[PDB]
C-alpha cells in the first residue's frame, strides 16, 4: 500500500490523475519525483521551471554545481538530485524535445529510466512545452515502465482524453 490518493489504473503497474505534479510532490513527499528536464539542467519552464519555482531555485543551484562537474546529460539520460522540500529525490529524465527536432525514438530510453525506481511520482515525458504527442507519450510509458509510476497530467482536457483514448 502506499500514499498516492485518487489515481486511475490504468496498467498492473501505472497510474494516472489530472494534478498539479507541484501539489502532488508537497502532499505525498513520494521517495521519487521526476522532473522533466533538458540536458543543461536548466529549469526555466513547463514542470522543470514549476519543480524548481517549488523548491525556492534550491533545486537550480543543486543543478548548476551538477553540471559544472558533469556536464550535460544525454538526451534519453537522467541523473538522481535531492527532492529538497518536494521528495527525498529527484529524477532528472531528459526526454527528446520536438521542438529542438531530437529523436522521437529516444522517448522509450528516456523512460526507461525509471525503471530503476520502484515507484515514481511522474509528469508524461516529452508531453508540454517538449512538443511530442503525449498520447503517444502514455503509449511509450505503459510499454516501458515496469515499475509503479503514477503519473500527474496538469490539464483537465488532455487528461480527459488520454482516459479516454486509452487501448
Ligand atoms: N505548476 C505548474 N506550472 O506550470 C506547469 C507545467 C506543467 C506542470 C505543472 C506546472
Given at each position: 500500500v502506499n500514499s498516492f490518493s485518487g489515481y486511475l489504473k490504468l496498467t498492473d503497474n501505472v497510474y494516472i490523475k489530472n494534478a498539479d505534479i507541484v501539489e502532488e510532490a508537497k502532499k505525498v513527499k513520494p521517495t521519487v519525483v521526476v522532473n522533466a528536464a533538458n540536458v543543461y539542467l536548466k529549469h526555466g519552464g513547463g514542470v522543470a521551471g514549476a519543480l524548481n519555482k517549488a523548491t525556492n531555485n534550491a533545486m537550480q543551484v543543486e543543478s548548476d554545481d551538477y553540471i559544472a562537474t558533469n556536464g550535460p546529460l544525454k538526451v534519453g539520460g537522467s541523473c538522481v538530485l535531492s527532492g529538497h522540500n518536494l521528495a527525498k529525490h529527484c529524477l532528472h529524465v531528459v526526454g527528446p524535445n520536438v521542438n529542438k527536432g531530437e529523436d522521437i525514438q529516444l522517448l522509450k530510453s528516456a523512460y526507461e529510466?525509471?525503471?530503476?525506481?520502484?515507484?515514481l511520482l511522474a509528469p508524461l515525458l516529452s508531453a508540454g512545452i517538449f512538443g511530442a504527442d503525449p498520447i503517444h507519450s502514455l503509449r511509450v510509458c505503459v510499454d516501458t515502465v515496469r515499475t509503479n509510476v503514477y503519473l500527474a497530467v496538469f490539464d483537465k482536457n488532455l487528461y480527459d482524453k488520454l482516459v479516454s483514448s486509452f487501448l
Open positions: 529510466n525509471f525503471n530503476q525506481h520502484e515507484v
